[PDB]
């Protein structure tokens, strides 16, 4: 039973780690996306010249 | 082979043994534009209509456009057998079997815009040099989906394909995802 | 990284440069609820998987004249009756590396667990010419399942493709799990392919493997039931192509298929959709060819190739307990013998429910170790005599001492055989267990206490006589010093078990 | 959408319609048919595309009545795979397969529609917490425990049980599970469905006063429907449950009965559809279709869909493919047997064959596992001594084996339950017994300690103390 | 039958050369589809139902079932 | 497994970033090519592609 | 199969 | 033959429908090779056989190798004749698949003399009149249930029971006694057991690692990897590879087929693939004709017998269903190998009681052989009866009239066990070959009752009767010590 | 079997014997199992007699109408 309570402790650890890290990474992806947008315009311009020889 | 392909091979074999193959090809084009425009197809189908009336009207349509007799013989045999309802498909596969017998290959050059005729003949040069056909025919189709180049649909029927087009982006990006 | 993410994109977009090859391409006539009778694919090799315009990978099995009838390896909802489908020079291969260890995969060799993405620069074609007779060898080294029943009566050697047939819900998945769980101290890469089992049972089995720690070395090729017919058809072939690579690079493997009944049933579906003429039980023409082509690549190679071995262990679910049906008689004609789990023996307490009867093995005593070659002889003979005298048990009223003692030792022998769930018995412990059961050193105890006495004896011996471990694990024979050590250990344990 | 159809052929329920070449619907895409009824113009029969025949025409099984349709009618496709209204609106209402209300009250709102035929949930997120459930039946709570958040199979012959058992189980659990209930009448007789509706509106589960207060939402595609409707009523119930597991995040208990009809209707349409026949006469895609239903029912880390399908083993063909592929998907199978209803032992669940993936000791309890092992071994012994009993006289077997036979008789009578919903067939009032009381009863019954009671004092008895009192009553009325 | 046995290209050439022309083949038939011990023959309209037809190698064939064109 | 589930989600997020933001980039790039639709593009691209394409074919 | 299975039962 | 250039139009599973120019079509059963290509980049050719003509110049043909990767329209080339199997003295020792390429990898076979697979039946002017039995070299077979020279023989016993040592002993004895030569032709032989058999052959001296074309087996192995066309035609390949032996050298050739039911199963697969409507239980319609073409070329022609031995695996153990029925219509002697006898160690494990032969009759064997054989079978029947009762009463308690019968039956069951010329590799017993005359006189001496006092174990694992009495007097000489 | 049960009987029949179907279906096993008998006690010897008296009366000669009480 004490092992089961320790399992509950580790389960709360995965709860907090999963939730907070997933929130921060879901924020990180948006941060990098909005950081990329000017460079995605530059990248589209780059592809345009490459595919027009 | 399909039944339409067999009947078309018969017509092409007769147009091969008799030196009228090109005239017979043009006659098949006329006959397939005749057997389009549904009411004619509906008339030559619909077995309720008497066979004598059908063959009489067929004789009239024959003497109208001045067809080759062996092609007229072919349509008349098609009326004789119960296989007259395959007539559109038979005249459709006639182009395939005729191209195969006369030795020419079709290459449908589909690009974004209409193509120059000399440069189309250059495409014919290349396609011929990978196929090996005498009088390689190129029926081109203008397409809006492509972006810069063109696609070739040479082969048996669409079978082989080479394309420098929106497929360029498509393959670069299938290799960009890389999962 | 903030823009190095798109600087990584520059690598690909400046690397790939579009050589203008020819892609075999044709239209789609018919999308037939799991099949796509596409037209015009002319020079497409039979088996060359096609790729549609919506990214629905599918194999081109049925190559008719006017319509190559392909089958879909995914859902086929988004095919649009005319979308140009392009062939791909792949001939249905999968990537394979030792990085596949532990991660459960689909038949595309794409990880379905989630906890990573396997990289593999070595690709093995799925269907392949199986090991020929120049390559194969006779079965030398045994493969302990952890079961006294299927390790003493009827062995399973490395290379011999024994078959777990039986009624539904009898322990086929349980004996397979016992084998893969025992196979921890050894080195085998136990590829466990699951065909048409539900997703939740595969979750239970993968988490059971994880709890027992065996998941380090066992690629569980999972195929849920809602995977299309092609993927359940392809799963055994996928796991075979993984274990085949591991076998060719010297590593002994063990591939355990799951429900070949379900796999050939999925082939039945895809072929009856594909308009191929059906034979017996509506299974198509090449069911036997199918099962052989994936089950006869289970061999023990030679020193010319690496000495590694793939050792299959299929599972065939037969209903009502018959050998007569089409697929079980096919798989029984293919597999080197079989075993027989039975529902009535299972509900009679005997677990694993190994039929002591018809479950023959074609190898025989050429597989087992010398200790087993010694003691399993007496065990097999005594089980034969007990099974013959089984009718006398309920009617033995003061019959002569030979019959009485032999039948009583048989009544104790079946209790010796029945062992708990997921309990792996390594070779040394089951050796002493069989010896204890066969030479009479448990005749004084009643029927019930044999189990408890033997578990306590195995604990006491394996924890207080480590010389037995040295002898059996090392010298691999039941020589006289080991026999005397075991005799004294069993005697002292019987004294302390009288002291209770 | 707008793609006008011109229905070409109508061969039974399967109708195939020839769209224009460019605009052609996809597979499993709904087709509402703008057609006339037998009398009166407005009549929209729904058809779901099954395959495309390549002559610009697709084959589409008809969900509604097939008569009255003419060759050439204009039809349009929704473009969406037969959206069904679910959510906070679907409660309390008997729902049709089309996505319509049937109980002649007000129409529901369509603010929370959902496609009926969707992707199966991926293995990456799969909640599997192995835990037992206390349904209430003595035998099935002891011999074949049920896995909540998992699937349960009430297999049986024709009339053995599996509907009175489903009615008893819903009468038990509809109040216990705080999650909603969903009943899928996949090809069950219309009068039993109406009995269920009356029983639900009487037992407070429906609560017809405020229809938003029901703990249930019914879906009936019952027997009197074209084989389209029985091919998709299971998926309608599945879509309601999948909404209650995606959005409300609550453990919804769905009941499907006669799931075998979801394969029989598939057979009846597949034979017409050009797909070749499989084994004994079902569809070729038996496994894929059966899995496409029974795989969507998994506890998926937002909730747990416990489901109890009542498979119809046709004519007690235990080897028939339609139950044989369901035995693979079903966790806690409960094979009801006509041979055990022959002698009146209701429910006629086989003590042997009714087995569960939850009879492992670490999952159920060591005492529970040992008592279930001893009960099942005793019944196996009785089945193996049936032939000796049948021919050679009851007495000529062994004397200890005679003790085992009497113990097995007492056991296989004692595992009979007087149900609340079956009070009309037995005449005795229904008795509910938990797992603990029947466990303690089986202990003292098989232990030989109370092996002196008469046999009929164990038959149709709720509990062991009730059995002891029944022995007193019976021995008194014996002499008196 | 959609794939009728008397629809080989070579054979239908023989009929397509003469629509309503010079007389038919009285007792000359070309064998076709000689597979599972059951040959089929184009024409050969003289054959009585049950007539005994011959072949080139010298093998004998009972002509049981003559359909519209193929005298099987 | 905790360290690797976030690895799965960061890999999925990275590749979804890649594919989606590029899809926006190319939906814009087709509009930039709308000015280069017919006049200045097709002659150059068709000539160069036909040259290299006939070369690859003759190889 | 309820026809063959009955006869298998009687044989056994 | 010629470049009959055709397109491989339709490829369903193994079946590959090919087309042709209208003039030249290969006839039925005419082998055609495709000029195929491997996806690894090798122009590998898979050979095919025209099984059914389909009219429009297209001959539906099955493939003797995998069709995985066969491009439609790939050049297919006719051979004009059926599959040319490389018969001769060259194919004496090596392992062959159906098309006749040595797969053991030793070396290429000299293709000087090649007969087609499909040579037709021999007529009645060719078949032999007199029905001479076949002196194999096992005492049990050549007393209790003789094998018919020129006829069929069935080994109903399982595997592991001793089938491999039995067939090895038979091959060595045919090489020794007669001028014969054996041709093992395992159809659908599971490649593990195939390699087991090959290695046991090589370790028995039956075939020599060092001396090929002086060996005594022509192994034709139908693997199970191969498509159903191949493991069906492997039977006919063995048939013609032994038929050339008999009709060039005039020698008593043996022909071991692995399970005829496996051949019939392969035929069922290939017919279901061709799509012809399946017959009763599910074997092909042309079941009787097919397996009759397989098993009627096994006849004692006037050149020399081609007597064969065919394993038979009845499905679900009933001789009623068609395939074992149409086989047992052919079989002339059926000898079951018994697992209980094998576990006892009465090698060979052939059951003396249930093994039957149609050649046992007196006008065939000899009046004395039929009489002594019938009396031995009646004695063994008496023993199987009294084995129930000597468990309860004991030998001395029951009557001394048939206690002599029990003792003589012990002596007979022991005398039947012959030390082979192959069991030397397992135990070192030198092995004795026993013709019919020796076992006849010995069994008359045992059953008449002259040897009523010899110990039982003096009869076990011995050859002639004089050697048995030598073993007995040996035990007597050691009885003093 | 009957899926409506005693919900579709008069209250008189529901009161007299609604357990009748189950009582007879149970008596079936006491007939078959105790048919091959040894040591029949008063429980079995009297229960078989009660069941025989309960089963024997259900033998209506046809074309004879019975009012509901005439069954009650
Ligand atoms: N040694 C054992 N002790 C206790 N229970 C056992 C043992 N072996 C097997 N079982 C039982 O067997 C069941 C699982 O067996 P298994 O999964 O093979 O049945 P199955 O239905 O044939 O499998 P599948 O679903 O793959 O067909 C479990 O419920 C478990 O209780
Ligand atoms: N507990 C019970 N008591 C009395 N009769 C029962 C009981 N359970 C089942 N039965 C009988 O068996 C039948 C089973 O119900 P039913 O709905 O017919 O099953 P199914 O849905 O399989 O046809 C009932 O009609 C009833 O007559």
Cis preceding linkage at C391, omega within 30: no
Check: CB of residue H73 under 8 Å from CB of residue C42.
Answer: yes
Per-domain boundaries in chain C = 21-90, 91-368, 369-497
The neighbour count for residue E59, using CB atoms within 10 Å, is: 10
* Phi, psi for residue C14 in degrees, rounded to 5: -100, -10
Quick one: B55 and B85 in the same domain? Answer: yes
List all residues of chain B from 2 to 41 with a beta carbon under 8 Å from chain H: 6
Check: CB of residue B176 under 8 Å from CB of residue B130.
Answer: no
Give me the catalytic one of D59, D93, D162, D410. D162
The neighbour count for residue E20, using CB atoms within 10 Å, is: 9
Domain hosting B145: range is 104-179
CATH class of E24-72: mainly beta
Pocket of ligand 1 (CB under 6 A): C 168-174, 197, 201, 258-259, 317, 351-352, 420-421; D 328, 357, 359-360
Inter-chain residue contact B14 with E9, CB threshold 8 Å: no
Catalytic site includes residue H2: no
The angle that helices B69-80 and B21-34 make with each other, rounded to 10 degrees, is: 50
* Phi, psi for residue C40 in degrees, rounded to 5: 100, -15
The Cα–Cα gap between C412 and C441 comes to: 11
The domain boundary, picked from B76, B103, B130, lies at B103
Per DSSP, which regions of chain E are E strands?
A: 31-32, 40-41, 52-54, 60-62
| Residue D189 alpha carbon, nearest atom of ligand 2 | 21
Inter-chain residue contact B160 with C84, CB threshold 8 Å: no
C21-90: CATH architecture: Beta Barrel (2.40)
State the smallest CA–CA distance between residue D342 and chain I in angstroms.
Answer: 7
CA of residue C58 to ligand 1 center, whole Å: 35
Q: What's the CATH number for C91-368? A: 3.40.50.300
Quick one: B4 and B92 in the same domain? Answer: yes
| Nearest ligand to the C-alpha atom of residue D161 | 2
How many angstroms separate the Cα of E68 from the Cα of each of C209, D230, E33, E71, H174?
69, 46, 16, 8, 61
Quick one: B165 and B129 in the same domain? Answer: yes
Give me the catalytic one of D118, D189, D338, D409. D189
Name the closest residue on chain E to residue H60, using Cα atoms: E35
- DSSP annotation of C281: G
Check: CB of residue D326 under 8 Å from CB of residue D259.
Answer: yes
Inter-chain residue contact H9 with C138, CB threshold 8 Å: no
Experimental technique: cryo-EM
How many alpha carbons fall within 13 Å on the CB side of residue B138?
22
How many angstroms separate the Cα of D103 from the Cα of each of C13, C369, D42, D100, D201?
61, 73, 21, 10, 12
The angle that helices C4-15 and F2-35 make with each other, rounded to 10 degrees, is: 60
The Cα–Cα gap between C77 and C85 comes to: 15
CA of residue D473 to ligand 2 center, whole Å: 28
Q: Which tokens in the block code for residue I67?
A: 């009012």
The neighbour count for residue B47, using CB atoms within 10 Å, is: 10
Which candidate, H254, H122, H132, places its Cα nearest to that of H181?
H254
Inter-chain residue contact F11 with C5, CB threshold 8 Å: no
Is residue I42 in contact with ligand 2, taking CB distance under 6 Å?
A: no
| Touching subunits for chain H (3+ Cβ pairs under 8 A) | B, C, E
The domain boundary, picked from B65, B83, B103, lies at B103
The Cα–Cα gap between G7 and G1 comes to: 10
List of residues 6+ apart from D80 with CB closer than 8 A: D29, D30, D115
User: What is the domain count for chain B?
Assistant: 2
Inter-chain residue contact G5 with D318, CB threshold 8 Å: yes
Which candidate, H325, H305, H306, places its Cα nearest to that of H257?
H306
b/e H81-111 (16+ beta carbons within 10 angstroms → b): bbbbbbbbbbbbbbbbbbbbebbbeeeebee
CA of residue D142 to ligand 2 center, whole Å: 21
Which residues in chain E have their CB less than 8 angstroms from residue B74's CB? 16
**What is the sign of the dihedral through the CA atoms of B24, B27, B31 and B33?**
positive
Question: Domains in chain H, please, with CATH?
Answer: 2-82 (2.40.10.170), 83-359 (3.40.50.300), 360-479 (1.10.1140.10)
Quick one: B8 and B74 in the same domain? Answer: yes
- C171 three-class SS: coil
Quick one: B11 and B88 in the same domain? Answer: yes
The domain boundary, picked from B75, B103, B131, lies at B103
The Cα–Cα gap between E59 and E53 comes to: 9
State the smallest CA–CA distance between residue E64 and chain H in angstroms.
Answer: 19
List of residues 6+ apart from D145 with CB closer than 8 A: D132, D133, D332, D356, D358, D359, D364, D368
How many angstroms separate the Cα of A23 from the Cα of each of A26, A27, B81, H127, H345?
5, 6, 74, 90, 75
Fold of C369-497: 1.20.150
CA of residue I1 to ligand 2 center, whole Å: 7
How many alpha carbons fall within 13 Å on the CB side of residue H118?
15
Residue nearest to atom 21 of ligand 1 (CA): C169
Q: Does D361 touch chain C (CB under 8 A)?
A: yes
Same fold, C91-368 and C369-497: no
CA of residue C353 to ligand 1 center, whole Å: 10
The Cα–Cα gap between H305 and H296 comes to: 12
> What residues of I are labeled active site?
3
The Cα–Cα gap between H333 and H355 comes to: 8
Check: CB of residue I47 under 8 Å from CB of residue D456.
Answer: yes
Check: CB of residue C83 under 8 Å from CB of residue C38.
Answer: no
* Phi, psi for residue C423 in degrees, rounded to 5: -90, 110
List all residues of chain H from 422 to 481 with a beta carbon under 8 Å from chain C: none
How many alpha carbons fall within 13 Å on the CB side of residue H385?
10
Could you give the dihedral angle defined by the CA atoms of residues H189, H194, H197 and H198, in that order, rounded to the nearest 10 degrees? 130
Quick one: B11 and B98 in the same domain? Answer: yes
Inter-chain residue contact D390 with I36, CB threshold 8 Å: yes
The angle that helices C287-295 and C229-248 make with each other, rounded to 10 degrees, is: 30
| Residue C317 alpha carbon, nearest atom of ligand 1 | 27
Q: Which of A9, A28, A29 to mutate to test the interface with F (most CBs of F within 10 A)?
A: A29
Question: Over the Cα atoms of chain D, what is R_g?
Answer: 25
Inter-chain residue contact C80 with D24, CB threshold 8 Å: yes
* CB nearest to H53's CB, from E9, E10, E33: E33
């Amino acid at each position: 039973l004490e092992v089961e309570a320790k399992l509950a402790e580790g389960r709360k650890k995965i709860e907090v780690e999963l939730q907070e890290a997933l929130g921060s990474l879901e924020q990180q992806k948006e941060d990098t996306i909005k950081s990329l947008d000017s460079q995605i315009s530059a990248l589209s311009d780059d592809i345009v010249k490459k595919v027009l020889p | 082979d399909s039944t339409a392909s067999r009947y078309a091979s018969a017509l092409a074999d007769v147009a091969d043994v008799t030196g009228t193959l090109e005239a017979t090809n043009s006659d098949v084009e006329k006959l397939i534009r005749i057997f389009s425009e549904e009411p004619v197809y509906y008339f030559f189908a619909n077995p309720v209509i008497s066979i004598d009336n059908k063959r009489s009207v067929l004789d009239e349509i024959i003497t109208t456009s001045g067809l080759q007799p062996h092609t007229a013989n072919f349509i008349n045999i098609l009326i004789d057998s119960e296989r007259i309802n395959l007539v559109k498909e038979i005249l459709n596969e006639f182009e395939d079997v005729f191209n195969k017998i006369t030795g020419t290959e079709v290459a449908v050059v589909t690009s974004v815009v209409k193509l120059e005729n000399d440069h189309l003949a250059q495409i014919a040069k290349g396609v011929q040099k990978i196929t090996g056909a005498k009088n390689v025919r190129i029926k081109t189709v203008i397409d809006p989906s492509l972006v810069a180049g063109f696609t070739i649909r040479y082969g048996n029927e669409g079978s082989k394909l080479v394309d420098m087009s929106v497929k360029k982006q498509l393959e670069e990006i299938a290799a960009q995802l890389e999962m | 990284r903030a823009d190095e993410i798109s600087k990584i994109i520059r690598e690909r977009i400046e690397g790939y440069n579009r050589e203008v090859k020819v892609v075999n391409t044709g239209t789609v006539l018919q999308v037939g609820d799991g099949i796509a009778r596409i037209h015009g694919l002319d020079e497409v090799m039979a088996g060359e998987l096609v790729e549609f315009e919506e990214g629905t990978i599918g194999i081109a099995l049925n190559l008719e004249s006017n319509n190559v009838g392909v089958v879909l390896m995914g859902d086929g909802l988004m095919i649009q009756e005319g979308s140009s489908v392009k062939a791909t020079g792949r001939i249905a291969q999968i990537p394979v590396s030792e990085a596949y260890l532990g991660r459960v995969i689909n038949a595309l060799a794409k990880p379905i667990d989630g906890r990573g993405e396997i990289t593999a620069s070595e690709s093995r074609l799925i269907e392949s010419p199986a090991p020929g007779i120049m390559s194969r060898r006779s079965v030398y080294e045994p493969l302990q399942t952890g079961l006294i029943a299927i390790d003493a009566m009827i062995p399973v050697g490395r290379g011999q493709r024994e078959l777990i047939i039986g009624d539904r819900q009898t322990g086929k998945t349980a004996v397979a799990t016992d084998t893969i769980l025992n196979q921890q101290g050894q080195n085998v890469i136990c590829v466990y392919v699951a065909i048409g089992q539900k997703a939740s049972s595969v979750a239970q089995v993968v988490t059971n493997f994880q709890e027992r720690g065996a998941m380090e070395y066992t690629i569980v090729v999972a195929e849920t039931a809602d995977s299309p017919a092609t993927l359940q058809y392809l799963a055994p072939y996928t796991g075979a192509a993984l274990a085949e690579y591991f076998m060719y690079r010297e590593r002994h493997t063990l591939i355990i298929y799951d429900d070949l009944s379900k796999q050939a049933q999925a082939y039945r579906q895809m072929s009856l959709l594909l308009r191929r003429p059906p034979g017996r039980e509506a299974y198509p023409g090449d069911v036997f060819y199918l099962h052989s082509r994936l089950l006869e690549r289970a061999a023990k190679l030679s020193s010319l190739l690496g000495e590694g071995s793939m050792t299959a262990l299929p599972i065939v679910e037969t209903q009502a307990g018959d050998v007569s049906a089409y697929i079980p008689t096919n798989v029984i004609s293919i597999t080197d013998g079989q075993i027989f789990l039975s529902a009535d023996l299972f509900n009679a307490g005997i677990r694993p429910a190994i039929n002591v009867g018809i479950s023959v093995s074609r190898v025989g005593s050429a597989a087992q170790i010398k200790a087993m070659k010694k003691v399993a002889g007496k065990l097999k003979l005594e089980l034969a005599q007990f099974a013959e005298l089984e009718a006398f048990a309920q009617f033995a009223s003061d019959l002569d001492k030979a019959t009485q003692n032999q039948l009583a030792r048989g009544q104790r022998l079946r209790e010796l055989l029945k062992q708990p769930q997921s309990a792996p018995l390594t070779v040394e412990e089951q050796v002493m267990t069989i010896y204890t059961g066969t030479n009479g050193y448990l005749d004084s105890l009643e029927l019930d206490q044999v189990r408890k006495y033997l578990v306590e004896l195995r604990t006491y011996v394996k924890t207080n006589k480590p010389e037995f471990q040295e002898i059996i694990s090392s010298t691999k024979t039941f020589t006289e010093e080991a026999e005397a050590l075991l005799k004294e250990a069993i005697q002292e344990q019987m004294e302390r078990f009288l002291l209770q | 959408k707008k793609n006008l159809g011109r229905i070409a052929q109508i061969i039974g329920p399967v109708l195939d319609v020839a769209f224009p070449p460019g605009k052609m619907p996809n597979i499993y895409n709904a087709l509402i048919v703008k057609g006339r009824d037998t009398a009166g113009q407005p009549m929209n029969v729904t058809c779901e595309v099954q395959q495309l025949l390549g002559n610009n025409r697709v084959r589409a099984v008809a969900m509604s009545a097939t008569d009255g349709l003419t060759r050439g009618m204009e039809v349009i496709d929704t473009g969406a795979p037969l959206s069904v209204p679910v959510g906070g609106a679907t409660l309390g209402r008997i729902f049709n397969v089309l996505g319509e209300p049937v109980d002649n009250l007000g129409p529901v709102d369509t603010r929370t529609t959902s496609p009926i035929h969707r992707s199966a949930p991926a293995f990456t997120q799969l909640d599997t917490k192995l835990s037992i459930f206390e349904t209430g039946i003595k035998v099935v709570d002891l011999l074949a425990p049920y896995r909540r958040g998992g699937k349960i199979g009430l297999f049986g012959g024709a009339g053995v049980g599996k509907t009175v058992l489903i009615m008893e189980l819903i009468n038990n659990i509809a109040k216990a599970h705080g999650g909603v209930s969903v009943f899928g009448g996949v090809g069950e007789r219309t009068r039993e469905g109406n009995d269920l509706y009356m029983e639900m509106k009487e037992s407070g589960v429906i609560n017809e006063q405020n229809i938003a207060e029901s703990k249930v939402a019914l879906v009936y595609g019952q027997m009197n429907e074209p084989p389209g409707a029985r091919m998709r009523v299971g998926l309608t119930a599945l879509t309601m449950a999948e909404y209650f597991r995606d959005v409300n995040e609550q453990d919804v208990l769905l009941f499907i009965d006669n799931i075998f009809r979801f394969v029989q209707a598939g057979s009846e349409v597949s034979a017409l559809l050009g797909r070749m026949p499989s084994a004994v006469g079902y569809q070729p895609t038996l496994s894929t279709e059966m899995g496409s239903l029974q795989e969507r029912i998994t506890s998926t880390k937002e909730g747990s869909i416990t489901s109890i399908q009542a498979v119809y083993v046709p004519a007690d063909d235990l080897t028939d493919p339609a139950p044989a592929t369901t035995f693979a998907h079903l966790d806690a199978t409960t094979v009801l047997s006509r041979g055990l209803a022959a002698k009146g032992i209701y429910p006629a669940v086989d003590p042997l064959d009714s087995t569960s993936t939850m009879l492992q000791p670490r999952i159920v309890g060591e005492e529970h596992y040992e008592i279930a092992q001893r009960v099942k071994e005793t019944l196996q012994r009785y089945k193996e001594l049936q032939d000796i009993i049948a021919i050679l006289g009851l007495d000529e077997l062994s004397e200890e084996d005679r003790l085992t036979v009497a113990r097995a008789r007492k056991i296989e009578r004692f595992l009979s339950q007087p149900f609340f919903v079956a009070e009309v067939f037995t005449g005795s009032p229904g008795k509910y017994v938990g797992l603990a009381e029947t466990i303690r009863g089986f202990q003292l019954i098989l232990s030989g300690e109370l092996d002196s009671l008469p046999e009929q004092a164990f038959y149709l008895v709720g509990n062991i103390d009730e059995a002891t009192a029944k022995a007193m009553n019976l021995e008194m009325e014996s002499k008196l | 039958a959609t794939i009728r046995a008397d629809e080989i290209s070579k054979i239908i050439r023989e009929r397509i050369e003469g629509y309503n022309r010079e007389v038919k083949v009285v007792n000359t038939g070309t064998v076709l589809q000689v597979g599972d011990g059951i040959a089929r023959i184009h024409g050969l309209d003289e054959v009585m139902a049950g007539e005994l037809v011959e072949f080139e190698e010298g093998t004998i064939g009972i002509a049981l079932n003559l359909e519209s064109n193929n005298v099987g | 497994y905790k360290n690797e589930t976030i690895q799965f989600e960061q890999q999925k997020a990275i590749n979804q970033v890649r594919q989606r933001v590029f899809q926006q980039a190319l939906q814009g790039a087709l509009g930039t090519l709308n000015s280069c639709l017919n006049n200045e593009l097709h002659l150059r691209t068709i000539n160069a592609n036909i040259g290299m394409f006939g070369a690859m074919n003759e190889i | 199969c309820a026809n063959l299975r009955e006869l298998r039962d009687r044989i056994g």
